[PDB]
Design a protein around this nucleic acid. Structure first.
Ligand SMILES: NC[C@@H]1O[C@H](O[C@H]2[C@@H](O)[C@H](O[C@@H]3[C@@H](O)[C@H](N)C[C@H](N)[C@H]3O[C@H]3O[C@H](CO)[C@@H](O)[C@H](O)[C@H]3N)O[C@@H]2CO)[C@H](N)[C@@H](O)[C@@H]1O
Ligand SMILES: [Mg+2]
Ligand SMILES: [Mg+2]
Ligand SMILES: [Mg+2]
Ligand SMILES: [Mg+2]
Ligand SMILES: [Mg+2]
Ligand SMILES: [Mg+2]
Ligand SMILES: [Mg+2]
Ligand SMILES: [Mg+2]
Ligand SMILES: [Mg+2]
Ligand SMILES: [Mg+2]
Ligand SMILES: [Mg+2]
Ligand SMILES: [Mg+2]
Ligand SMILES: [Mg+2]
Ligand SMILES: [Mg+2]
Ligand SMILES: [Mg+2]
Ligand SMILES: [Mg+2]
Ligand SMILES: [Mg+2]
Ligand SMILES: [Mg+2]
Ligand SMILES: [Mg+2]
Ligand SMILES: [Mg+2]
Ligand SMILES: [Mg+2]
Ligand SMILES: [Mg+2]
Ligand SMILES: [Mg+2]
Ligand SMILES: [Mg+2]
Ligand SMILES: [Mg+2]
Ligand SMILES: [Mg+2]
Ligand SMILES: [Mg+2]
Ligand SMILES: [Mg+2]
Ligand SMILES: [Mg+2]
Ligand SMILES: [Mg+2]
Ligand SMILES: [Mg+2]
Ligand SMILES: [Mg+2]
Ligand SMILES: [Mg+2]
Ligand SMILES: [Mg+2]
Ligand SMILES: [Mg+2]
Ligand SMILES: [Mg+2]
Ligand SMILES: [Mg+2]
Ligand SMILES: [Mg+2]
Ligand SMILES: [Mg+2]
Ligand SMILES: [Mg+2]
Ligand SMILES: [Mg+2]
Ligand SMILES: [Mg+2]
Ligand SMILES: [Mg+2]
Ligand SMILES: [Mg+2]
Ligand SMILES: [Mg+2]
Ligand SMILES: [Mg+2]
Ligand SMILES: [Mg+2]
Ligand SMILES: [Mg+2]
Ligand SMILES: [Mg+2]
Ligand SMILES: [Mg+2]
Ligand SMILES: [Mg+2]
Ligand SMILES: [Mg+2]
Ligand SMILES: [Mg+2]
Ligand SMILES: [Mg+2]
Ligand SMILES: [Mg+2]
Ligand SMILES: [Mg+2]
Ligand SMILES: [Mg+2]
Ligand SMILES: [Mg+2]
Ligand SMILES: [Mg+2]
Ligand SMILES: [Mg+2]
Ligand SMILES: [Mg+2]
Ligand SMILES: [Mg+2]
Ligand SMILES: [Mg+2]
Ligand SMILES: [Mg+2]
Ligand SMILES: [Mg+2]
Ligand SMILES: [Mg+2]
Ligand SMILES: [Mg+2]
Ligand SMILES: [Mg+2]
Ligand SMILES: [Mg+2]
Ligand SMILES: [Mg+2]
Ligand SMILES: [Mg+2]
Ligand SMILES: [Mg+2]
Ligand SMILES: [Mg+2]
Ligand SMILES: [Mg+2]
Ligand SMILES: [Mg+2]
Ligand SMILES: [Mg+2]
Ligand SMILES: [Mg+2]
Ligand SMILES: [Mg+2]
Ligand SMILES: [Mg+2]
Ligand SMILES: [Mg+2]
Ligand SMILES: [Mg+2]
Ligand SMILES: [Mg+2]
Ligand SMILES: [Mg+2]
Ligand SMILES: [Mg+2]
Ligand SMILES: [Mg+2]
Ligand SMILES: [Mg+2]
Ligand SMILES: [Mg+2]
Ligand SMILES: [Mg+2]
Ligand SMILES: [Mg+2]
Ligand SMILES: [Mg+2]
Ligand SMILES: [Mg+2]
Ligand SMILES: [Mg+2]
Ligand SMILES: [Mg+2]
Ligand SMILES: [Mg+2]
Ligand SMILES: [Mg+2]
Ligand SMILES: [Mg+2]
Ligand SMILES: [Mg+2]
Ligand SMILES: [Mg+2]
Ligand SMILES: [Mg+2]
Ligand SMILES: [Mg+2]
Ligand SMILES: [Mg+2]
Ligand SMILES: [Mg+2]
Ligand SMILES: [Mg+2]
Ligand SMILES: [Mg+2]
Ligand SMILES: [Mg+2]
Ligand SMILES: [Mg+2]
Ligand SMILES: [Mg+2]
Ligand SMILES: [Mg+2]
Ligand SMILES: [Mg+2]
Ligand SMILES: [Mg+2]
Ligand SMILES: [Mg+2]
Ligand SMILES: [Mg+2]
Ligand SMILES: [Mg+2]
Ligand SMILES: [Mg+2]
Ligand SMILES: [Mg+2]
Ligand SMILES: [Mg+2]
Ligand SMILES: [Mg+2]
Ligand SMILES: [Mg+2]
Ligand SMILES: [Mg+2]
Ligand SMILES: [Mg+2]
Ligand SMILES: [Mg+2]
Ligand SMILES: [Mg+2]
Ligand SMILES: [Mg+2]
Ligand SMILES: [Mg+2]
Ligand SMILES: [Mg+2]
Ligand SMILES: [Mg+2]
Ligand SMILES: [Mg+2]
Ligand SMILES: [Mg+2]
Ligand SMILES: [Mg+2]
Ligand SMILES: [Mg+2]
Ligand SMILES: [Mg+2]
Ligand SMILES: [Mg+2]
Ligand SMILES: [Mg+2]
Ligand SMILES: [Mg+2]
Ligand SMILES: [Mg+2]
Ligand SMILES: [Mg+2]
Ligand SMILES: [Mg+2]
Ligand SMILES: [Mg+2]
Ligand SMILES: [Mg+2]
Ligand SMILES: [Mg+2]
Ligand SMILES: [Mg+2]
Ligand SMILES: [Mg+2]
Ligand SMILES: [Mg+2]
Ligand SMILES: [Mg+2]
Ligand SMILES: [Mg+2]
Ligand SMILES: [Mg+2]
Ligand SMILES: [Mg+2]
Ligand SMILES: [Mg+2]
Ligand SMILES: [Mg+2]
Ligand SMILES: [Mg+2]
Ligand SMILES: [Mg+2]
Ligand SMILES: [Mg+2]
Ligand SMILES: [Mg+2]
Ligand SMILES: [Mg+2]
Ligand SMILES: [Mg+2]
Ligand SMILES: [Mg+2]
Ligand SMILES: [Mg+2]
Ligand SMILES: [Mg+2]
Ligand SMILES: [Mg+2]
Ligand SMILES: [Mg+2]
Ligand SMILES: [Mg+2]
Ligand SMILES: [Mg+2]
Ligand SMILES: [Mg+2]
Ligand SMILES: [Mg+2]
Ligand SMILES: [Mg+2]
Ligand SMILES: [Mg+2]
Ligand SMILES: [Mg+2]
Ligand SMILES: [Mg+2]
Ligand SMILES: [Mg+2]
Ligand SMILES: [Mg+2]
Ligand SMILES: [Mg+2]
Ligand SMILES: [Mg+2]
Ligand SMILES: [Mg+2]
Ligand SMILES: [Mg+2]
Ligand SMILES: [Mg+2]
Ligand SMILES: [Mg+2]
Ligand SMILES: [Mg+2]
Ligand SMILES: [Mg+2]
Ligand SMILES: [Mg+2]
Ligand SMILES: [Mg+2]
Ligand SMILES: [Mg+2]
Ligand SMILES: [Mg+2]
Lengths: 47, 273
RNA sequence: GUGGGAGAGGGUGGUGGAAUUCCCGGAGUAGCGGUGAAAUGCGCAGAUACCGGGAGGAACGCCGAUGGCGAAGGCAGCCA
RNA sequence: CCGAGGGUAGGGCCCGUGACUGGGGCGAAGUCGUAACAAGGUAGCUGUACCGGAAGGUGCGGCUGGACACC
RNA sequence: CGCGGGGUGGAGCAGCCCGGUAGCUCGUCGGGCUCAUAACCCGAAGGUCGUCGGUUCAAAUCCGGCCCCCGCAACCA
RNA sequence: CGGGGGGAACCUGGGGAACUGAAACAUCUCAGUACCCAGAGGAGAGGAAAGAGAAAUCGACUCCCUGAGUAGCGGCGAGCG
RNA sequence: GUGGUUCGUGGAGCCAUGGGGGAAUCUGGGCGGACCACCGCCUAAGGCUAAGUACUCCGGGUGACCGAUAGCGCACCAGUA
RNA sequence: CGAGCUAGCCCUGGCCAGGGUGAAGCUGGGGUGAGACCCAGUGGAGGCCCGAACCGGUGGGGGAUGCAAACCCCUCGGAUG
RNA sequence: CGAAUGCCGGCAUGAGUAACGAUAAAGAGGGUGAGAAUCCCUCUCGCCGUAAGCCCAAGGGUUCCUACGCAAUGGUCGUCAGCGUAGGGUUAGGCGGGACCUAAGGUGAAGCCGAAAGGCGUAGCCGAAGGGCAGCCGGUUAAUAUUCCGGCCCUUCCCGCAGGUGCGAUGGGGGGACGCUCUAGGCUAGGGGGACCGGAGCCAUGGACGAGCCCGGCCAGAAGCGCAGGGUGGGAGGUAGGCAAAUCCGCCUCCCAACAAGCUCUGCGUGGUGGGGAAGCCCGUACGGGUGACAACCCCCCGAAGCCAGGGAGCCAAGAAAAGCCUCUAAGCACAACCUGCGGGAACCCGUACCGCAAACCGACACAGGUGGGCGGGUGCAAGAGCACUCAGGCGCGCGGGAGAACCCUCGCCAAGGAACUCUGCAAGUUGGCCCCGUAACUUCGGGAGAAGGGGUGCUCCCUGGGGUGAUGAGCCCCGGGGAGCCGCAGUGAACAGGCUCUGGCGACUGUUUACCAAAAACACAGCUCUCUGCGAACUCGUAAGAGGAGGUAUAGGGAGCGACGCUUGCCCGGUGCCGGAAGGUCAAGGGGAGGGGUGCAAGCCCCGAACCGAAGCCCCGGUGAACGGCGGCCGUAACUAUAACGGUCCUAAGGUAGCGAAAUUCCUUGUCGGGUAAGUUCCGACCUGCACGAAAAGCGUAACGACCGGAGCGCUGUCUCGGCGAGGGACCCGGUGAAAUUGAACUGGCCGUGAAGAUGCGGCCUACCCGUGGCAGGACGAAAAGACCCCGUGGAGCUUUACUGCAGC
RNA sequence: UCGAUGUCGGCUCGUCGCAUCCUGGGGCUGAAGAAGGUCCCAAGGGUUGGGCUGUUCGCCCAUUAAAGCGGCACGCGAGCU
């Protein structure tokens, strides 16, 4: 039955997207943390 | 007054619809005069701040003239009487002789051929607006300005009206639809007569759905919730209230007066029995 | 048919004054009410009695009769 | 084919009967009060409405088959 | 068993709780009013305080035992 | 002409917890800690007495040692200092 | 009315200041633990000021530091699969 | 950090085989002082009926280291709101 | 280090055990190859066919095509593949999206607010599955195509020539521009039939050389035209309104139309050219290619839910915006500009493979689950997207071969009986569609109602009514009607398709709910009542700004209870809550300074500090019951007895009225009586000793309704007496692949005792050759889960209030 | 035994005890016969169908030679409900 992953490429980048993070102070520190750790991808894939 | 229905269903039984014989138009309204609107009951933060609202038929908002004093002395013919789904009352479409078209809330007694005016000049007859100070004591009156030049706030709903009981200096004493006795400034415009579509109070919704179409959602009793949810609930097997009956936010809902004491408004009120 | 008459005859709309009650103001003090006699009630948080204002509803004194009208029930301030 | 009638099904009317229940008639000397007949001690009666152990009481309107002092 | 209150003239209640005093209304008895009964008026009689034991100078009264009464409780199981 | 944004930890400023301790818990403690925010920089802060405080004394500020778990503070408790 | 201080309302001063009232320029004003006198100390309501101090992304030296289940999560193409 | 599941609301689109009953209204006729009304045809109302799609999840059986971390079979509720 | 249900890794047991993932289904020949049930071809068989076929959107992201491969991946095998290596493949001015519009929302010059981070906000801006906008048919590749190509159309920009005109916009106006249900007339997709047209070929096995049988009889297309539809007045005069100006728009007046009459726009039709084009035979194909042919290319009918499209009608709940578009004037410019037509030019970026109800997406899997739009043929059955078979197309579900035990699951049938089963007809059966007859209580007059209960149902021939289309005719199609016959056990012949009645409880009703053990008598619901709220409303969210409320105004809005409807809803205001009360009482800060104190030589400076004045709140007085709530006890009494209409007394703020009543409430209790039954703790009626009903936490009824809960009957049954037989998928045997919880170690018997009280393990005695397979579950206090009950802990968390103390709010 | 010994009743399947319900054998009798009463021996076998209730039990209908009482974790849920 309907499961929890219902992928929508637009929704993915307007929610977790790079511009999205950059808009909220909560969100900028998400980036700082990922950069400080050396994540290859600071922000999700979406095509 | 009031269409009824043979009971070919349950709830077609006591269901009741208004009498639209008065409506001289339908499928209008004057396209020049109306924008749109929306809400949810939710507010600018997204939050429900009025409960049990939503759904219901899409409406277009008829723009409507509550300042009649900007046309002083210009006459107008009553053009049409049609349906407004934002109010209890019906709106009269009227053409001015300026060629300006405007909406008026329809007094009881307007046939559509008739001329109407507004201003100190103003014959005293149904449909005409004057400042209160020129209207003779005793007149039944609707759509009243509370303060001068600010627009008509009072007696706007189907069947409502007010009466001039007398005057004192710059002010006149009014018996509102509530029965409250109120001073109002002499310079406030008002139009003579009562609102009409007065049988509005006798519609009988008749089924659940007809409440939803008006955008009214189901309303649940405190009684039926849990204690997180409301001052009355739990224990069950029902229960009496267990406590002086209360709103969800905790204040007492029987008897308890909410008007604020120090309002400078109080200096102008004498009543409300 | 014509010409005339009396009448609270019916329907509708209006409208007047007397009174009662309620409130607002004035003045004023120790009771008021009520009954067979009382008590309940009302009153020094200012009652009753008196003056002024106002709100509202109901019924129409004298004319009025042992009277008129109406099929009966009934119909009574005044105007159309 | 029709056909006495037998069967299955559903109605109608009438009689009988029924735990129980409603009043009613009737039965010398049981209990409670006094409503009515004399302003019957509240004139009575009345349709209706509410009430009350009971008779009755009270409201609104009605009928007379009720009415020598005093204001 | 468990906890609380109770038992007083014929009926119904005070008084106990603060030791010495037993009261109220009805009823009953005698008399009056009345042709007579009720009503009403004038007088009166009537009890050992459930019972047993203790405390004290003195116990309806304070204490304990039993005997009846009314009441609440008896849950997780 | 300048600002903006970034920087491991360190610094100042604005704000600021709870578990826990108290062998329960409110004052108290943990603690001006964790965190969040703003601004510095290679350091930051502070600094030249409207100071100490008993000696007719000492002389700006910072940091270390000591004074000293002293003086005090404290449901005069746990503790704090 | 509060915060700071060892100071928890305490005899509670000092420094700070959200609110009300509200001065003077040497004979002026703050202070020395309520307050008063005396004797002292100091000059608020403007600002800047190296060094001695903290820290370690980074470079180097040295270990009675580990030796692939240890030492950083990662000795290996790891903040990766 | 999450409303890509889920709950509500907002905006904008879309879907609902086929059958069954036959409201008001209108028309004509009767009726009447004039009406109410009665009848007939027409008409096509309704959180109306039957029943697919779509939405559900009634009862039972199976499954129970499953095909499946909610499934399958049979039956069954709504289906212009 | 031996233990921590320790941690990390490795390897065991269970065990060659269970499974190998839908019961749609396979068999043979030939080919390739080291190797073949599994790959390729053919033939036969079976399965889907409102799908299991085809197209689109999401999402996935090279999975697409081909060459060479088989270690692994594939629940077996694999020579095959969605897998490995490599190479190749996605072509647009017109399709989608952007150099267009605006919607919710978002964002945000101005502005407002907030310790900081930030919050808000008009204009603007962004934002789409909405509005706007120009491409149809075929052919082509291994693989792309409205993209390349062929044929035929079309749009914008740019520049030029001609003709026209007051030109000109971010501004004004028009339009765009809209619901739901029903729906006319004309079309098209689509489909059916033809004795008419075209075509390879066929006579089998008894018959048939035939008006035989099988195959096909279209597609697109500018202008012009025709049919059908949409939209639409014309002229003047005045003109104060449309935040400037308008000639436009609006408004008034007069004049002609009254009609699509015209003007205009779209649909279809036809149209120059263009292009398709079967069965069959042949080769030869993961695929399709010659021919059939020079193909034919036409009539009739059925007919949309699609089109004309802003069509029409009715109803109430009253049904987006903005740009493109046209019109109007403004500056401004009138050489310009704009309009119209022709011509040349110029016309960018991204998507484009493939999967796409699934082995390519969401579900850790090649997973019986989930996933929006469109097409979805034929026949028959009343209709239909239902059901059975079947086109095209696509599949036989990636372990097989046997055997024919128990047992299990899914299914079939059953003598006699018929609920005797059982908590309960649970289950299963009966019934079943359509037409016709017929149909009760009661009822809110609609219902109840498919009530119930019956009859018909096929085929052949005769006669015959009405309709649609054509002509009024045939033909074709739809709807019947009557008459006479035939066959079977049976004609809705197979498939899909109510069992029914009586009577209670609860809820009026359709609805709603615990995703995943509860669908209900719970929630909601129209409706009734109370209450607050005069509008910068009350209320709610927010520190605030602001917002909702509501662009509403008491016939409105918030809160609360009750819950259609009918008849109704008593008494008590002592307490509590709310409401009213200008007095009195007490009251905090502040005002007040009687008086007292410290210290100074003193002037002073500095502490205390009585009376008194002084808010709300509490006290006090009163009102309030669809506010919280509450509505008695003992004793006596009637000419049989019983009983008590009646009295007595004690208490209360007041003592339960109506109506119900062993109840969804009744303890005693299976109360007593009556009904039903052969028999009734249930159920129905009644009585009233109501432990412990009772009136809006409503009381008592109520037609209709219900996957609710109770009681009875009929019908019918494998529920049962009581089992039997049969089918299929497992189970069993063989080949291939091959798990799991669990496991101190094991050489693991019975009894009677004993033992921490329930011994394979200790004692005595009995019994017992070693090892397995198929089976059953009594025991290892069997596995699983550090018992959820219970207690403990000065453990924890949700919840309440006249617990304490705070805080917001007021 | 709380790092789990599932708990009433039904059903299925039984097995054992005897304090015997029946059948067999007996003594006594207030045993004429028949038919009972009571006590003794005896565990081989047998011990019904149904209404009510979840019920065990119990009452009841119709029968019977009889309609026995107990134990087996109130026998038996890795057997079912
Ligand atoms: N039949 C007359 C009607 O009945 C009623 O009358 C009935 C009663 O009211 C009346 O009862 C009366 C009683 O009122 C009166 N005051 C006392 C008297 N003894 C009783 O009488 C009764 O009692 C005894 C039995 O013991 C019988 O013998 C006697 O016949 C009988 N009347 O007796 C009648 C029944 O028998 C009313 N009067 C009224 O309804 C009407 O007139
Ligand atoms: Mg997941
Ligand atoms: Mg998307
Ligand atoms: Mg979304
Ligand atoms: Mg990288
Ligand atoms: Mg937001
Ligand atoms: Mg509502
Ligand atoms: Mg409501
Ligand atoms: Mg509700
Ligand atoms: Mg609840
Ligand atoms: Mg919550
Ligand atoms: Mg609460
Ligand atoms: Mg409650
Ligand atoms: Mg309860
Ligand atoms: Mg209570
Ligand atoms: Mg007369
Ligand atoms: Mg016959
Ligand atoms: Mg017959
Ligand atoms: Mg009388
Ligand atoms: Mg009398
Ligand atoms: Mg009298
Ligand atoms: Mg009398
Ligand atoms: Mg008399
Ligand atoms: Mg009375
Ligand atoms: Mg004594
Ligand atoms: Mg408990
Ligand atoms: Mg910086
Ligand atoms: Mg700070
Ligand atoms: Mg502690
Ligand atoms: Mg502790
Ligand atoms: Mg604690
Ligand atoms: Mg601290
Ligand atoms: Mg800080
Ligand atoms: Mg420095
Ligand atoms: Mg500095
Ligand atoms: Mg500095
Ligand atoms: Mg500290
Ligand atoms: Mg401090
Ligand atoms: Mg402090
Ligand atoms: Mg201090
Ligand atoms: Mg000092
Ligand atoms: Mg000085
Ligand atoms: Mg100072
Ligand atoms: Mg000092
Ligand atoms: Mg000092
Ligand atoms: Mg100093
Ligand atoms: Mg510095
Ligand atoms: Mg280094
Ligand atoms: Mg080494
Ligand atoms: Mg390592
Ligand atoms: Mg090694
Ligand atoms: Mg590691
Ligand atoms: Mg959502
Ligand atoms: Mg969602
Ligand atoms: Mg129909
Ligand atoms: Mg219909
Ligand atoms: Mg329906
Ligand atoms: Mg239906
Ligand atoms: Mg239905
Ligand atoms: Mg249905
Ligand atoms: Mg189910
Ligand atoms: Mg809707
Ligand atoms: Mg050890
Ligand atoms: Mg095994
Ligand atoms: Mg096996
Ligand atoms: Mg197997
Ligand atoms: Mg070969
Ligand atoms: Mg070979
Ligand atoms: Mg070979
Ligand atoms: Mg088909
Ligand atoms: Mg895509
Ligand atoms: Mg393999
Ligand atoms: Mg092109
Ligand atoms: Mg585009
Ligand atoms: Mg854009
Ligand atoms: Mg460009
Ligand atoms: Mg754009
Ligand atoms: Mg835009
Ligand atoms: Mg700004
Ligand atoms: Mg914002
Ligand atoms: Mg825009
Ligand atoms: Mg778009
Ligand atoms: Mg579009
Ligand atoms: Mg396009
Ligand atoms: Mg093509
Ligand atoms: Mg122009
Ligand atoms: Mg417009
Ligand atoms: Mg065609
Ligand atoms: Mg056809
Ligand atoms: Mg032959
Ligand atoms: Mg053939
Ligand atoms: Mg065609
Ligand atoms: Mg054509
Ligand atoms: Mg050829
Ligand atoms: Mg239209
Ligand atoms: Mg724009
Ligand atoms: Mg392509
Ligand atoms: Mg599927
Ligand atoms: Mg689909
Ligand atoms: Mg596929
Ligand atoms: Mg998958
Ligand atoms: Mg598979
Ligand atoms: Mg699948
Ligand atoms: Mg599926
Ligand atoms: Mg779907
Ligand atoms: Mg079709
Ligand atoms: Mg059919
Ligand atoms: Mg089908
Ligand atoms: Mg398989
Ligand atoms: Mg049988
Ligand atoms: Mg039978
Ligand atoms: Mg039975
Ligand atoms: Mg069943
Ligand atoms: Mg019925
Ligand atoms: Mg039938
Ligand atoms: Mg029925
Ligand atoms: Mg026949
Ligand atoms: Mg036949
Ligand atoms: Mg046709
Ligand atoms: Mg079948
Ligand atoms: Mg069927
Ligand atoms: Mg059916
Ligand atoms: Mg019935
Ligand atoms: Mg019952
Ligand atoms: Mg219901
Ligand atoms: Mg429904
Ligand atoms: Mg329904
Ligand atoms: Mg619910
Ligand atoms: Mg659930
Ligand atoms: Mg369920
Ligand atoms: Mg249901
Ligand atoms: Mg607030
Ligand atoms: Mg607002
Ligand atoms: Mg607002
Ligand atoms: Mg608004
Ligand atoms: Mg409301
Ligand atoms: Mg309720
Ligand atoms: Mg009441
Ligand atoms: Mg009463
Ligand atoms: Mg009270
Ligand atoms: Mg009171
Ligand atoms: Mg006072
Ligand atoms: Mg003072
Ligand atoms: Mg002195
Ligand atoms: Mg006060
Ligand atoms: Mg009071
Ligand atoms: Mg009873
Ligand atoms: Mg009860
Ligand atoms: Mg009953
Ligand atoms: Mg109740
Ligand atoms: Mg109540
Ligand atoms: Mg109720
Ligand atoms: Mg009831
Ligand atoms: Mg009912
Ligand atoms: Mg339902
Ligand atoms: Mg139900
Ligand atoms: Mg069987
Ligand atoms: Mg078999
Ligand atoms: Mg283990
Ligand atoms: Mg052995
Ligand atoms: Mg043993
Ligand atoms: Mg076993
Ligand atoms: Mg087994
Ligand atoms: Mg076991
Ligand atoms: Mg276990
Ligand atoms: Mg434990
Ligand atoms: Mg639990
Ligand atoms: Mg404790
Ligand atoms: Mg605790
Ligand atoms: Mg245990
Ligand atoms: Mg264990
Ligand atoms: Mg024996
Ligand atoms: Mg024997
Ligand atoms: Mg014998
Ligand atoms: Mg035996
Ligand atoms: Mg035996
Ligand atoms: Mg039973
Ligand atoms: Mg029993
Ligand atoms: Mg036991
Ligand atoms: Mg047992
Ligand atoms: Mg079990
Ligand atoms: Mg059991
Ligand atoms: Mg067992």
């Amino acid at each position: 039955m309907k499961r929890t992953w219902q992928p929508n490429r637009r929704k993915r980048a307007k929610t977790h997207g790079f511009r999205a993070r950059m808009r909220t102070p909560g969100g900028r520190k998400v980036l700082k943390r990922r950069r400080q750790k050396g994540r290859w991808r600071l922000t999700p894939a979406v095509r | 007054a009031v269409k009824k229905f043979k009971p070919y269903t349950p709830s077609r039984r006591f269901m009741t619809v208004a009498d639209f014989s008065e409506i001289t138009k339908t499928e209008p309204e004057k396209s020049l005069v109306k924008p749109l609107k929306k809400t949810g009951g939710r507010n600018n933060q997204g939050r429900i701040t009025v409960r049990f609202r939503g759904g219901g038929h899409k409406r277009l908002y008829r723009i409507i003239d509550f300042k009649r004093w900007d046309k002083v002395g210009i006459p107008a013919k009553v053009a049409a009487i049609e349906y407004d789904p934002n109010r209890s009352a019906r709106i009269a479409l009227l053409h001015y002789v300026d060629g300006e078209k405007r909406y008026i809330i329809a007094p009881d007694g307007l046939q559509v051929g008739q001329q109407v005016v507004a201003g100190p000049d103003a014959p005293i007859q149904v449909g005409n607006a004057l400042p209160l100070r020129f209207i003779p004591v005793g007149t039944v009156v609707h759509a009243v300005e509370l303060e001068p030049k600010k627009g008509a706030k009072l007696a706007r709903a189907a069947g409502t009206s007010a009466q001039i009981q007398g005057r004192e200096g710059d002010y006149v004493i009014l018996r509102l639809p509530s029965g409250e006795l109120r001073k109002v400034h002499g310079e406030c415009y008002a139009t003579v007569g009562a609102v009409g579509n007065a049988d509005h109070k006798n519609i009988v919704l008749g089924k659940a759905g007809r409440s939803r179409w008006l955008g009214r959602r189901p309303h649940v009793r405190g009684a039926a919730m849990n204690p997180v949810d409301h001052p009355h609930g739990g224990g069950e097997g029902r229960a009496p209230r267990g406590r002086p009956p209360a709103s969800p936010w905790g204040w007492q809902t029987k008897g308890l007066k909410t008007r604020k004491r120090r309002k400078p408004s109080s200096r102008f009120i004498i009543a409300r029995r």
